[PDB]
């Protein structure tokens, strides 16, 4: 749950993001301003400059960016979400 693989395509606005999960399917929705029962860590992803938008569906995720922006640009602040330390902060 962590970006597993990556997958070629022709084009190369959004590539699709691969799950340590399979078959069944997860979650499955889209996300074009923030808001939607997603991952607070996902919203800085719709945040961050350079990202158009987000498509959640069966065992893998379609991010597009903008033809103007790049990948090495947001690739770093995509990490970070899926890598930022997994805890249940209560106290």
Same mark, same amino acid.
């Given at each position: 749950? +962590?970006?597993?693989?990556?997958?070629?395509?022709?084009?190369?606005?959004?590539? +699709?993001?691969?799950?340590?999960?399979?078959?069944?399917?997860?979650?499955?929705?889209?996300?074009? &301003? $923030?808001? !939607?029962?997603?991952?607070?860590?996902?919203?800085?992803?719709? &945040? $961050?400059?350079?990202? +158009?938008?987000?498509?959640? $569906?069966? !065992?893998?995720?379609?991010? !597009? +960016?903008?033809? !103007?922006?790049?990948?090495?640009?947001?690739?770093? &602040?995509?990490?970070? $979400?899926?890598?930022?330390?997994?805890?249940?902060?209560?106290?």
């Amino acid at each position: 749950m +962590k970006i597993i693989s990556i997958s070629e395509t022709p084009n190369h606005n959004t590539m +699709k993001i691969t799950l340590s999960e399979s078959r069944e399917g997860m979650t499955s929705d889209t996300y074009t &301003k $923030v808001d !939607d029962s997603q991952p607070a860590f996902i919203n800085d992803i719709l &945040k $961050v400059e350079g990202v +158009k938008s987000i498509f959640h $569906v069966m !065992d893998f995720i379609s991010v !597009d +960016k903008e033809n !103007d922006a790049n990948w090495e640009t947001v690739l770093p &602040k995509v990490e970070a $979400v899926f890598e930022l330390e997994h805890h249940h902060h209560h106290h």
